[PDB]
Design a protein around this ligand. Structure first.
Ligand SMILES: Cc1cc2nc3c(=O)[nH]c(=O)nc-3n(C[C@H](O)[C@H](O)[C@H](O)COP(=O)(O)OP(=O)(O)OC[C@H]3O[C@@H](n4cnc5c(N)ncnc54)[C@H](O)[C@@H]3O)c2cc1C
Ligand SMILES: [Zn+2]
Ligand SMILES: [Zn+2]
Ligand SMILES: [Zn+2]
Lengths: 12, 746, 20
């Protein structure tokens, strides 16, 4: 669920 | 009778009991069963019984603990769990730099932060006997210590470690402690720091789940995806300590006394905390903001240091990446077109007792906002905006509540149906937001025909204009489909504030000590060779292994920088699908505060527009002194009105603003302004814009496409590369932090 | 974007609120 993810820890 | 561990694969050839509880303890001998905690830690069946059996002397201790455990934790209470929580001896590391050996503390000594901080080999309590002359640091280290750093040691640890007295605990009481790597038998931070998600919470920006690993955490530590407990606990502990003291570099030395858990696993915990720290550092979660180092104490291991980057543009994105990379130990040069740093941050300090931004000055949502963190680090206060914004008509009359409430209802209902209409539409079917709103509004008066008064129409115009301010564009150019695309992602929660000292204070501190070349517009970037060659407009050459471009969207659109090889047609299509929005500001100093009577403390007031075409001409006025002593108003020019203003000189713009203010305050004389500015961002050659928005036919995906690095060599940051957080200083800063992490890894 | 608004924030048109 991409709404919640931390911006800096979802850069794959 | 057995000398063999119950556990297949255990490397212990000689099991010893660590418990030594029962009078009949097997010690290093024979027992019906050896219970396996880890490869270095077992206990005998006699000590098992001591605690587990009703007739035995430890049953009272066990059941007392067991009840506490059962009403706090989610995990089944076991003699093993008990042993690991309560009986396993503590291991601590020697503080001497030349020694650093791990030692087991005797069974009854409880480890504390103070002991960990100061421990030395063979440290005993106070004694009257003269100490033996021996050297305890030369004593051989227990062979079991070596084994802990082997990948397989952890795979044979039965129960994950559970931290005691974790600084993160107070923030996590809503969760089962054992589920976040904390011991169920346990137990003044800036209100903008809310690093942990809470049950039933809505999405908010820069928030981590304390019980779930993020995607990049899974990627970097795949060995913890099946058992995330230890990682979670340490990461949570690291975030708790950073926010507890964001004015210092958080180091393994300062994390260690805060890791308190029994057994050899503590060795493993302190080994890992180091790697998790550097990861969190590289990623921009900690040891970040305006922290400086300064002068030779870099934030990432030397392994990262041998690499060089050129950053183009010294706005917030450029300086954020430059600050990070410099702090990492990486070599950084920045090239800036203009004769100053800051880009769209540019503060006027010449007003009496107040700082006024010609560009950015508001923080939109301070919770977990890196701007809020940076204010903490600098000891800067921010003024939280109050809610009240009265809609004042020309001339003087404050719009009545029922009229105000009614038209607010109707404006938002039009947006509801825009949202309903777009639901199954493709890019090719997109229409301008302004056109779509008009379409629904017309069919609304038709279908119901509920004529609005002229004033009701104008109040509606105020809301339309407020959207043009937000987008930096006339509504006829903004995408109905995509205008608010970013809200798909969790946004910054909580207060909007006025940054009273101005963003330039942050800009200046970020730049402090960096190599920044001013009046150096880049004209060409060649990434055809072994490293990149960058050439300024006067022919000066610079070279580095990596290049980061952070120039404004409008400049990418103009193609002012030649890329060799050229950018992909896909990148260019993204680049041209986004709008380069614009607003301008006027600021005005007066002899005294003439609005105080009617405005009554409100941070701003609204201006009901006389007609649609003028709706963007000073829709809102901002009172630039929170203390309410000085007299400075700021206002904004937006939408169709910015075009109406580009051929007007400053005096004319000023006359129109004064005409407006005099209409708004017709029930009195308003003094002439004694000082002022009018901005011209639109025609500033190296900027040419205020902030991006999505044009009709466009997609939020354009942000990601522009952000795409090229061959791990050419990188992109800037507000128009941040899909979650477009437009803002915070989004630009975060895009720079994002890129510095990508650049440091490559 | 809507997130730029401070005074008089619009509210209509928002996706259903997402919870944990
Ligand atoms: C009037 C106005 C009001 C604003 N209000 C707010 C607000 O209240 N809140 C908010 O968060 N944001 C606000 N902003 C938005 C904001 O300031 C930007 O989003 C932010 O500054 C963007 O940072 P950046 O690093 O991406 O780009 P920039 O700040 O534009 O920095 C870019 C730098 O690149 C340089 N450049 C261009 N070409 C070259 C080249 N060839 N070589 C070298 N350098 C080059 C530029 O000169 C510039 O210094 C406002 C902006 C404007 C204009
Ligand atoms: Zn025993
Ligand atoms: Zn074993
Ligand atoms: Zn020692």
């Amino acid at each position: 669920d991409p709404h919640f993810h931390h911006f800096l820890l979802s850069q794959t | 009778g057995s000398r063999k561990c119950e556990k297949a694969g255990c490397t212990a050839t000689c099991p010893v009991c660590f418990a030594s509880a029962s009078e009949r303890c097997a010690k290093n001998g024979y027992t019906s069963r050896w219970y396996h905690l880890s490869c270095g830690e077992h206990f005998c069946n006699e000590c098992f019984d001591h605690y587990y059996r009703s007739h035995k002397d430890g049953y009272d201790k066990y059941t007392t603990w067991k009840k506490i455990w059962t009403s706090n934790g989610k995990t089944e209470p076991s003699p093993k769990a008990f042993m690991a929580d309560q009986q396993l001896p503590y291991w601590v590391q020697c503080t001497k730099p030349e020694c650093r050996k791990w030692r087991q503390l005797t069974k009854e000594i409880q480890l504390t932060p103070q002991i960990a901080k100061t421990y030395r080999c063979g440290m005993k309590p106070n004694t009257a006997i003269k100490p033996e002359t021996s050297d305890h640091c030369s004593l051989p280290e227990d062979l079991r210590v070596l084994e802990v750093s082997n990948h397989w040691w952890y795979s044979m640890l039965i129960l994950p470690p559970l931290l005691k007295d974790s600084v993160a605990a107070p923030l996590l009481s809503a969760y089962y402690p054992d589920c976040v790597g904390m011991s169920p038998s346990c137990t003044g931070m800036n209100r903008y720091f809310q690093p942990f998600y809470q049950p039933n919470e809505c999405g908010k920006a820069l928030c981590v789940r304390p019980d779930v690993m993020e995607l990049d955490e899974l990627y970097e530590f795949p060995e913890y995806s099946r058992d995330p407990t230890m990682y979670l606990a340490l990461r949570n502990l690291i975030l708790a300590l950073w926010y507890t003291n964001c004015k210092e570099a958080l180091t393994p030395q300062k994390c260690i006394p805060h890791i308190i858990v029994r057994g050899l696993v503590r060795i493993r915990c302190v080994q890992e905390v180091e790697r998790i720290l550097y990861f969190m550092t590289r990623k921009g979660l900690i040891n970040t903001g305006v922290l400086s180092v300064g002068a030779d104490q870099y934030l990432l291991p030397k392994d990262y240091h041998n690499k060089s980057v050129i950053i183009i543009g010294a706005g917030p994105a450029g300086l954020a990446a430059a600050r990070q990379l410099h702090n990492f130990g990486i070599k950084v040069t920045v090239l800036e077109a203009k004769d100053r740093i800051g880009g769209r941050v540019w503060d006027d300090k010449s007003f009496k007792g107040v700082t006024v931004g010609r560009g950015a000055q508001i923080v939109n949502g301070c919770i977990n906002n890196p701007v809020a963190l940076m204010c903490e680090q600098l000891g800067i206060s921010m003024h939280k905006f109050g809610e009240r914004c009265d809609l004042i008509q020309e001339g003087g009359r404050i719009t009545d509540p029922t009229i105000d409430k009614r038209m607010d209802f109707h404006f938002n209902a039009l947006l509801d149906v825009v949202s309903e209409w777009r639901k199954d539409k493709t890019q090719l079917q997109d229409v301008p937001l302004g056109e779509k709103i008009e379409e629904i509004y017309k069919a609304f008066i038709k279908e119901s025909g509920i004529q609005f008064s002229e004033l009701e129409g104008q109040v509606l115009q105020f809301h339309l204009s407020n959207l043009e301010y937000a987008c930096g564009s006339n509504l006829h150019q903004v995408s109905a489909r995509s205008w608010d695309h970013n809200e798909f992602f969790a946004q910054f929660a909580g207060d909007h504030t006025l940054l009273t000292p101005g963003y330039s204070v942050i800009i200046e501190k970020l730049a402090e000590g960096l190599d920044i070349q001013l009046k150096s517009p880049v004209q060409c970037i060649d990434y055809s060779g072994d490293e990149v060659q960058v050439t300024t407009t006067d022919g000066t050459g610079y070279s580095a292994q990596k290049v980061l471009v952070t120039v404004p969207l409008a400049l990418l659109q103009k193609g002012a920088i030649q890329f060799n090889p050229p950018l992909s047609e896909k990148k260019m299509k993204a680049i041209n699908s986004l709008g380069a929005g614009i607003i301008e500001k006027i600021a005005l100093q007066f002899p005294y505060r003439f609005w105080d009577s009617k405005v009554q403390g409100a941070d701003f007031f609204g201006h009901v527009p006389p007609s649609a075409s003028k709706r963007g001409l000073f829709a809102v006025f901002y009172d630039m002194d929170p203390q309410k002593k000085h007299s400075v108003l700021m206002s904004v020019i937006a939408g169709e009105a910015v075009a109406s203003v580009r051929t007007l000189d400053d005096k004319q713009v000023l006359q129109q603003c004064m005409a407006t203010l005099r209409e708004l305050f017709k029930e009195q004389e308003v003094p002439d302004p004694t000082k002022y500015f009018v901005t011209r961002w639109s025609t500033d050659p190296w900027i040419q814009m205020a902030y991006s928005f999505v044009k009709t036919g466009g997609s939020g995906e354009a942000y990601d496409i522009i952000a795409e690095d090229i061959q791990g060599t050419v990188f992109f940051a800037g507000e128009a590369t941040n899909r979650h957080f477009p437009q803002t200083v915070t989004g630009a800063y975060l895009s720079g932090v994002r890129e510095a992490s990508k650049i440091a890894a490559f | 974007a809507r997130t730029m608004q401070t005074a008089r924030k619009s509210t209509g048109g928002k996706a259903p609120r997402k919870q944990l």
